[PDB]
Amino acid sequence: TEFKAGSAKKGATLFKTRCLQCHTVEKGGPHKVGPNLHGIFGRHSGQAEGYSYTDAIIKKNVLWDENNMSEYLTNPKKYIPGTKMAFGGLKKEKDRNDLITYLKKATE
Numbered sequence: 001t002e003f004k005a006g007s008a009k010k011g012a013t014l015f016k017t018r019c020l021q022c023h024t025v026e027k028g029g030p031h032k033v034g035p036n037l038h039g040i041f042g043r044h045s046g047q048a049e050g051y052s053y054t055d056a057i058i059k060k061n062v063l064w065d066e067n068n069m070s071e072y073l074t075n076p077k078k079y080i081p082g083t084k085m086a087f088g089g090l091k092k093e094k095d096r097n098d099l100i101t102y103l104k105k106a107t108e
C-alpha cells in the first residue's frame with residue numbers, strides 16, 4: 001500500500017491539462033501521439049494494437065496497476081529509459097493519486 005484514493009474530479013482535469021495532448025481514454029478512442037489508454041489497467045506495456053511503441057516499453061513489460069503507474073508518472077524516462085513518452089512527470093504524490101483515481105475509472 002503506497003497509493004491511496006484521490007479526487008476523480010481533480011483527476012479528470014489533470015488528465016485534460018497534462019495528458020490529453022497525446023492520449024484518449026475512451027473505448028473506441030483513437031491512438032494519437034500516445035496510444036489510446038482504454039483498458040490499460042492489468043495489461044502489460046506495449047500491447048495496444050495499431051500503435052508503434054518503442055523497443056524499450058515493450059521489453060520493459062510492465063503490468064499496469066495503480067502503483068506501477070504511480071512510479072511511472074513520477075518520471076517516465078527514469079522508469080523506462082528509452083521511452084518516446086516526452087512528459088517530465090508529476091512530482092506531487094497527491095496529483096498522481098487524483099490522476100490514477102480518474103484513470104482507474106475512465107479507462108474501464
Ligand code: HEC
Nearest residue numbers: 018019022033034045046047053054057083084085086087
Ligand atoms: C505526449 C507529449 C505525451 C504526454 C503529454 C503523455 N504521454 Fe503517455 N505516452 C506517450 C507516448 C508517445 C507513449 C508511448 C511511448 C513509447 O515508448 O512507445 C506513451 C505511453 C504511455 C503509457 C504506457 C502505455 C502502454 O500501452 O503500455 C501510459 C500508461 C501513459 N502514456 C500515460 C500517460 C498519462 C497518464 C499522461 C498524463 C499524466 C501521459 N501519458 C502524458 C505520449 C505522451
